[PDB]
Design a protein around this ligand. Structure first.
Ligand SMILES: [Zn+2]
Lengths: 186, 132, 44, 102, 149, 95
RNA sequence: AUUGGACUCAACGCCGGACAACUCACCGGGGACGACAGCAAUAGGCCAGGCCGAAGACCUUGCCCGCUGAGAGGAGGUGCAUGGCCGUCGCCAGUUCGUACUGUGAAGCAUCCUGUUAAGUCAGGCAACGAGCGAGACCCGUGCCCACUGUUACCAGCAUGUCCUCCGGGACGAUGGGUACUCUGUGGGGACCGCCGGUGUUAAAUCGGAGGAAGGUGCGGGCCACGGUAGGUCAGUAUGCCCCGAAUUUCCCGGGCUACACGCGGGCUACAAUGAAUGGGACAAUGGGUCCCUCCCCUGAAAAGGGCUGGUAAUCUCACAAACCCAUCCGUAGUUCGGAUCGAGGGCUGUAACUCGCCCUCGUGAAGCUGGAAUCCGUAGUAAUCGCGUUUCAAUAUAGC
């Protein structure tokens, strides 16, 4: 029942990130009609989602039906409501910017500046992973309201995490995002 | 006419459906005569507010009890609190309320609650394992 | 689904320390990671 | 006497109570003999796990307590009334159960 | 009323045991002298009248606890099982002992067959009320304020 | 010398000899056998040189006399068969 | 072969790691296993049998990859390259930024003194002024009141279905019925050091008074920062490089991790009238069960077997709680108080029980007789204690929770 629904809502578009992350994956919301189990993808650049004449769309059907008992396997391709407010593709974009030749010193700074300019209470992109030498470091950026203990870390604030497969090693990002809502006017 | 309250402070679990009425004087304390009250060892703890009320009062009174569960000592004091409340609910004086509060409340809530939700790190709620 | 450790948990290919409780079929680390995404929450 | 029973037990009880009030207003519009919203016991499903992944590490257990809020309501049976109850916009957070006892 | 609950359980159960001893239909069948009271205890019973008293106790348990199945009776008739250095589970009673006692009870007509065990028959209830009046006759002088005053 | 004198034990029935054996062996033989012990029984009833490979099997009535070879982690070991060991387990002799 | 990680706190009932195949990672013995490439010369399958544990494994026969490289992969390495996770400093209050300002400068001031606080919590006075993260606030736990609230919870009168006759009824809440009073689970109030009498200063802060459910963190909990501790995590997960690329890949068979001169860590049982039989009373919740617990019936001494009933679970069952207490029975001593080994025997679980299981029954009833140095846990329904589910799911929990 609810456990299987939570498992599918946490897994179905999250195993799509093994191939859909190149198109600008940003998570999904479950819209479960009793007629059919709708699945959505928020594509930053959904031209690749359109596919090489359907080559990309039609790879999301066999797994959905062979082992999950779903009717009408379909995923409409849309985009996220706000670009910088979604933290997952922001972390993916920062990792790609590191991997591609962008200023790895300045990529995290520009990403944090863009996210805080997009209407956030606070943000922090922190990069744990060996960027230059053979020893691990940290590149934390501190700006804006980011509470760490209580209700906001439970549900109010979210996380954007990615990976980075470099030749020295593999790292990621931890961009914290809080939606601009007042907690307590005390 | 008839008094039906099981609130007693709820020592762990109580389940004491009070039933106090007025009749000829034949008093049946939970399908058991008071002369040969079946618990016996725990009736000394339970007959305190009724003893304070007086033989003439409870002889005038008529009481029955409906029960569900609870531990034996939790029963033995929660039912006593329920009987005290049933005594005061029937048309009576506040002198009995003063006497009931005089000895050890028996109209209040048990301030020591059920348990304390023992945390991982030891056997008990506060106790822990032995560090060498 | 009847064996000692033949069945593996989801994602993590593993044959020991898997939570088969509640029909979850996840390892303890993996289930700990994804309980907050699957609707579970440490309410107490 | 005939009754149509409603069984719900879910994760979010606010929309559950909203659907209960919606069915109650539907019954008062249709004049259906209704039983009031009955708070059933909530399934407090719990399963803990040790926090520490590696070998060394003291007692660290994140306990996964989950409440499954149950509610049982009884109302009468009627074809237009049952179609009205079946066309209600109920949220996904609860499961809707019916027993047509006549 | 001459209910059983107006008398202590010891005197009433002993009276029922004596009345069943007077009745030939209750007997210790064969293996009474080589089997214990169940599985929990250490040794067989030492009391002479263990079978009749056990049947009377099962009758009183069926009366005061409604229809009881044989496994409910076994669960009621468990004990602190000795395991040596193990955490002392309480397991069960004995199936054959309880079943033979219950069959003797129904052959005596006191127990009535039911789906969820065997509730006590109405005749046994009436006779045990009369026996309660007998034992209450032994203490009728306790409270004179009980007839119509 | 189990149930009777040693002479007639080889010609006893399977279930009668099982009743001669305890409950564990009787239930081991009661719920059928896998393919390996059936092959071992067939080859014993043929008479060729046999390496059993099973350390839990039950010695049979007419199976005695001929030598049984058992895999012992290290490769194989040859062990004699006597009336004393009938109904026993094959792995009880080569630890 | 008796596999590795881990070694004060914060390793030694830990790695959910209670290993019978898997788990598996040590090994015995086979067998399959290189995407592409170079190159020797598409192989298997398929009667039977030889041997082969066995495996058409490969052979006598019926009969339509040899290998390297680069790969997957690798439970091999390095936790001393990592990602992310966690122990711990540590509930610890700390960490701090802006502005000006002192200082040649590292840095100082705020971040100080006085009180206070659970806390850099706060007030007072200051060359300081403001602000953030931690903290608290916050989310929970449960107890006093109510809004609606009944099923599968409930009887509390209304009335029935059988006995007592001394007479209301005892039993029945299955029900009609009544949700009269309640448990009720969704929204709300409550107890803020608030008022009053002391202290501190007249501040922040501090005691009994309250007929009051908690007077002054009501009571217990999760979340717990800046950083280090090159702490553990390549063995949950992904991953760099060295390596393994026909073995460290890969699938079963057998053994092993249980092997034991043995040092050590934590647990389960034990020596009284505070104890062995027999009854008595209803007792507790957390949480399971539909592919699994079990209703009643039958069979045995037991474990248990057949049949059959209840359960997608406020229905139903594991489900008896034990500890208990008493007409009592029970006996005087280190023994009915006290039970580790081992010999026959019957069980269900599993594909397999010798290594290597647990259940059951009998006979041996032993060691032993409150334990020094040293330590250890703990402040209210808490220590202690008595047993209970659940997780490691085939059993086995002296275990964790
Ligand atoms: Zn996993």
């Amino acid at each position: 029942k609810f456990v299987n629904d939570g498992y599918v809502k946490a897994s179905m578009d999250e195993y799509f990130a093994e191939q859909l992350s190149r198109a600008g994956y940003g998570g999904m919301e479950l819209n479960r009609t009793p007629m059919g189990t709708q699945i959505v993808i928020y594509s930053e650049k959904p031209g690749m989602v359109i596919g090489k004449a359907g080559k990309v769309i039609r790879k999301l059907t066999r797994d959905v039906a062979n082992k999950y008992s779903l009717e009408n396997p379909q995923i409409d391709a849309q985009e996220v409501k706000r670009p910088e407010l979604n933290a997952q593709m922001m972390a993916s974009r920062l990792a790609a910017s590191i991997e591609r030749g962008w200023y790895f010193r300045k990529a995290g700074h520009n990403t944090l500046r863009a996210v805080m300019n997009a209407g956030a209470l606070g943000c922090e992109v922190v990069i744990s992973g060996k960027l230059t030498g053979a020893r691990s470091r940290v590149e934390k950026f501190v700006d804006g309201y980011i509470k760490h203990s209580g209700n906001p870390v439970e549900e109010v604030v979210d996380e954007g995490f990615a990976v980075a497969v470099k030749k020295l090693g593999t790292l990621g990002c931890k961009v914290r995002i809080i939606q601009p809502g007042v907690v307590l006017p005390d | 006419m008839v008094k039906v309250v099981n609130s007693s402070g709820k020592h762990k679990t109580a389940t004491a459906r009070a039933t106090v009425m007025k009749g000829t004087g034949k008093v049946r304390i939970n399908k058991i005569p008071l002369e040969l009250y079946t618990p016996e060892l725990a009736m000394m703890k339970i007959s305190e507010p009724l003893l304070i009320a007086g033989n003439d009062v409870v002889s005038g009174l008529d009481i029955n009890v409906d029960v569900r569960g609870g531990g034996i000592i939790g029963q033995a004091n929660a039912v006593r609190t329920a009987v005290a409340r049933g005594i005061v609910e029937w048309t009576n004086d506040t002198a009995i309320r003063d006497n009931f509060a005089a000895y050890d409340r028996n109209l209040l809530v048990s301030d020591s609650r059920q348990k304390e939700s023992k945390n991982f790190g030891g056997p008990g709620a506060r106790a822990k394992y032995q560090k060498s | 689904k009847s064996g000692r450790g033949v069945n593996e948990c989801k994602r993590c290919g593993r044959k020991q320390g898997l939570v088969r409780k509640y029909d979850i079929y996840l390892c303890r680390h993996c289930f700990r990671e994804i309980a907050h995404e699957m609707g579970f929450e440490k309410y107490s | 006497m005939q009754k149509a029973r409603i069984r719900l037990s879910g994760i979010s009880p606010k929309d559950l109570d909203g659907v209960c009030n919606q069915v109650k207003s539907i019954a008062e519009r249709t004049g259906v003999n209704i039983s009031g919203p009955v708070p059933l016991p909530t399934k407090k499903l719990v399963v803990p796990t040790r926090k520490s992944p590696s070998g060394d590490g003291t007692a660290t257990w994140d306990h996964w307590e989950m409440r499954v809020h149950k509610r049982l309501i009884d109302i009468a049976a009627d074809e237009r009334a049952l179609r009205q109850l079946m066309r209600i916009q109920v949220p996904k957070d609860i499961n809707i159960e019916i027993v047509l006892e006549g | 009323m001459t209910t059983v609950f107006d008398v202590p359980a010891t005197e009433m159960i002993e009276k029922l045991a004596g009345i069943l001893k007077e009745d030939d239909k209750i007997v210790p069948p064969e293996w009474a002298g080589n089997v214990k009271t169940g599985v929990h205890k250490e040794l067989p019973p030492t009391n002479d009248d263990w079978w009749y008293i056990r049947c009377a106790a099962v009758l009183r348990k069926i009366y005061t606890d409604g229809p009881i199945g044989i496994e409910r009776l076994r669960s009621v008739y468990g004990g602190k099982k000795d395991n040596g250095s193990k955490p002392f589970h309480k397991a069960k009673g004995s199936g054959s002992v309880a079943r033979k006692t219950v069959q003797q009870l129904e052959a005596a007509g006191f127990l009535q067959k039911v789906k969820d065990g065997r509730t006590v028959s109405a005749k046994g209830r009436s006779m045990m009320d009369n026996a309660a009046h007998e034992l209450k006759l032994e203490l009728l002088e306790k409270i004179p304020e009980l007839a119509k005053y | 010398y189990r149930g009777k004198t040693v002479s007639e034990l080889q010609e006893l029935s399977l279930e009668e000899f099982a009743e001669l054996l305890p409950s564990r062996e009787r239930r081991s033989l009661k719920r059928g056998f896998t393919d390996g012990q059936k092959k071992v029984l067939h080859e014993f009833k043929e008479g060729k040189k046999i390496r059993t490979h099973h350390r839990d099997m039950i010695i049979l009535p007419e199976m005695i006399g001929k030598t049984i070879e058992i895999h012992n982690g290290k490769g194989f070991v040859s062990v004699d068969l006597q009336p004393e060991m009938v109904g026993h387990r094959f792995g009880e002799f080569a630890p």
